[PDB]
Symmetry: D2
Subunit: 244 residues, 4 copies
């Protein structure tokens, strides 16, 4: 089992991709700490993890929340070996309608969060001479998308951040990578009309949406000892929607 | 190739790249408004622009400063046709030494500024069905660089922003593009040791530093009517240091 | 911006993009040699070039034809300063239907031709310590396209070739670059059904086809003294169809 | 075990990366057919594979050799499920010294081979509604390298080819991907002076060469059912030497 003895922190693990990531790391031997933004969300994460981890309330924009969560992780489980930055929001609008706080909230939540959490786990990874940081990107970070300039900025920015951090820590056995999903099936997409789905599918050579478990498999590959020579990279998981 | 009757605003036009951009747009017939962060800096810009423009004090992190500058431009010259986002700062540090405000100030000054300024000029461009937005990026935005994770995040971010904005306004005759310099002769590079220079030149096939005027030429090409089918693109001007 | 005293060779200059390139270089002061695959095609090129150049018959797959054309150019005009590799063909088919000669002919005509022509002009450029090589790529080289695996291979290949050549000759004042058009109005596109056009326009933010002159403007920029710090680069001119 | 019941064909499996790929696929349940260019090389492959596969003599430039090898595979094992295109050569020279046959041999061996072998296995993959094609690229295909314009052309070209093929076959459950190694330890590199090594290591943030087994792990990930939503992609395995 790949992750026996490892402690993973997966931000935004309530559902969909973040839950599939948490469950996959559990299935391969890790102890997982999954986060949500509320105390009930955190309890629902504890309920699915059971004996293989815990749910905690974390707001990745608030440094006091980050510090409190990591202290709790350290007391109960130990140091973080694997950080998976999945927490992310969208607040879409065309530029002229985009409010200052819609811009700021996305930049804080989706880009500056990657800085804060990576900084907060890095020292203990450097001491172990081994670490994994994986952030969940988006195809929109590379292509752009009308009405999502805030989101695209954050998702492109976290790649620049990750490349620079990778260059600093590569020689100490820590890799820093991004997984960029395409269109993935969630509750959201399951609620759409057949016509809304058909237009999304038309953009995907594979002819289907991706599944959360497909993103989890890519994360788990990069987090494993079989990916120790991959750093500063973006792994695109999108059914051929965008080929780099 | 002529800009007669066009109004350009070039942020951070005191020296180096921003000055060369301002002078080059003048040489092609534009009226140019260059900015600096102090009243004396703005006056030095007015001195070199003379009859073909003026200098103004602008803080690109302050919406009140942006609006005051644009209202002055609108009263004296008219609406901005060409926006060149050149203003930017660096606060280098390895991640472990990087203070929260060194992150925040770079994100605000180098990325969020591009959103605020673009938003502030866009309506008048959309009415005319013609416009240019050009932002000065960096090779670091695409490659990453140790000790500049903040700067790389902002410079990568501004590309994602620019692709998204490009997609929103392409059908109204507005293009949005990035020019990414390599190592350019500037106060910054003149202040390096001979050894820091030599090592950076070894990574440049051309075997020399670029000039500010070389960046200005690329900007002036993209700002022209001869580049109306180029949008959402990044023009790398780096002597082969990085080939995309 | 002027090419007075420069000699340019533009392969495949009968019509469309190659003609627009030839005419634009004339308009900027160059003497232009345009090529076609027949003696009547070459004469039609001579008719439009008049006093500012000539047409010649060239087969870019035949080294004897290349050498005969260059010797004619050298006798009448002088050494080539600017090479524009525009010659190219398509032989579309899904992989299972693609005949061996449909693969081979595209590779020979669209990729190996760029090697032979570049090699044939390079020595005189190196002696002068000044030169331009510009090859016309395609968006398909970066994105791929079903039914054009041969064409995509050649157009992607020529970029790898161009980056390698750029690295060899950058320090001698020669740049080597690619211009990658999107969907441009040409005989090809005029011969499509209204439905094939409409579907391709839906993928273009600009909402229109590009013109040959738009490609020519980008080529003329790169061929100029104002682009001496741009090498190994790909300039995408596609109305936002693909944003790198 | 991931590959139980699968037949993999790994071209160029004598040593280094191709051998590590063959051995890794064996270790995960596949029957492997590994190739070499001589009858003794093929026998040495049979010796290491033992009961889990066979060695055969294959020249990927010769269609009669391709057909004979695939007929042998089909009679003894069955249809190919996984094709790994590892066969590759270099014949380096600066452009002016590069002979026509040095160009042609690399294009035939490293690019056209990918077309021929992919075409030869595709029909049976389409019938199974499941398939993997993985080609071994190189960082040089994306960066370029002086003295390797032939190699860079071929390695860039095979990405264009792979993207186009992926677009044709994505909806039938076949993925087509590239693994791009950086600097990998081989017999060659083990024979170098400490000074030659030191210069190579200086370009690699990880501070070490990659191992053949690291490339094999990436191949095996893409060949598995855990990578069914990854197609048309390039996975860079280079210790941060090049970050895309
Ligand atoms: N779905 C797709 O097709 C797709 C495609 C590409 C990329 N992505 C990326 O995948 C990730 C998952 O998002 P999603 O839309 O798929 O599903 P989601 O269920 O909305 O997940 C978002 C998660 O982020 C957490 N979160 C939000 N704001 C936060 C904050 N301030 N602090 C900490 N956690 C916060 C949420 O917490 P609660 O549990 O408390 O709400 C939730 O767990 C995001 O990074 C997204 O950008 C998704
Ligand atoms: O080094 P540099 O390269 O010369 O570029 C920095 C430029 O950006 C300007 N700049 C820095 N921070 C700014 C802010 N907050 N708002 C507007 N312009 C700013 C600087 O103004 P100053 O010329 O006033 O430094 C300078 O012109
Ligand atoms: O469609 P198109 O686009 O108009 O471009 C094709 C151009 O490339 C030229 N071309 C095609 N095959 C060639 C070869 N083997 N050698 C030189 N030029 C070639 C064509 O010459 P022609 O004008 O003679 O077709 C034509 O000018
Ligand atoms: N080593 C690195 O650092 C590195 C880096 C990036 C990419 N690569 C790529 O990895 C692959 C392995 O090459 P290598 O240099 O690492 O080791 P290598 O041991 O030289 O492998 C090359 C293999 O290709 C086979 N081959 C050569 N010409 C052939 C032909 N005409 N038909 C069929 N097979 C042929 C050889 O056969 P024989 O066994 O009969 O000689 C040999 O098995 C190549 O695609 C290479 O471009 C390697």
């Amino acid at each position: 089992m790949s992750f026996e003895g490892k402690i993973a922190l997966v931000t935004g693990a309530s559902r969909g991709i973040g839950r599939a990531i948490a469950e996959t790391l559990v299935a391969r031997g890790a102890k997982v700490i999954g986060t949500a933004t509320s105390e009930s969300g955190a309890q629902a994460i504890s309920d699915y993890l059971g004996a293989n981890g815990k749910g905690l309330m974390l707001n990745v924009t608030d440094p006091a929340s980050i510090e409190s969560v990591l202290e709790n992780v350290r007391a109960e489980f130990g140091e973080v070996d694997i950080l998976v930055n999945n927490a992310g929001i969208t607040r879409d609008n065309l530029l002229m309608r985009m409010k200052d706080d819609e811009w700021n909230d996305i930049i804080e939540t989706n880009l500056s969060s990657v800085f804060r959490l990576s900084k907060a786990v890095m020292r203990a990874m450097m001491k172990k001479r081994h670490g994994r940081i994986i952030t969940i990107g988006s195809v929109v970070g590379t292509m752009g998308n009308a009405g999502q300039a805030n989101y695209a900025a954050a998702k492109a920015g976290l790649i620049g951040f990750s490349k620079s951090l990778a260059r600093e820590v590569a020689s100490r056995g820590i890799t820093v990578n991004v997984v960029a999903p395409g269109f993935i099936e969630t509750d959201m997409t399951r609620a759409l009309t057949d016509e809304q789905r058909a237009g999304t599918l038309a953009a995907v050579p594979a002819g289907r949406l991706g599944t959360p478990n497909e993103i989890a498999s890519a994360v788990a590959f990069l987090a494993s000892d079989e990916a120790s020579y991959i750093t500063g990279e973006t792994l695109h998981v999108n059914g051929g929607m965008y080929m780099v």
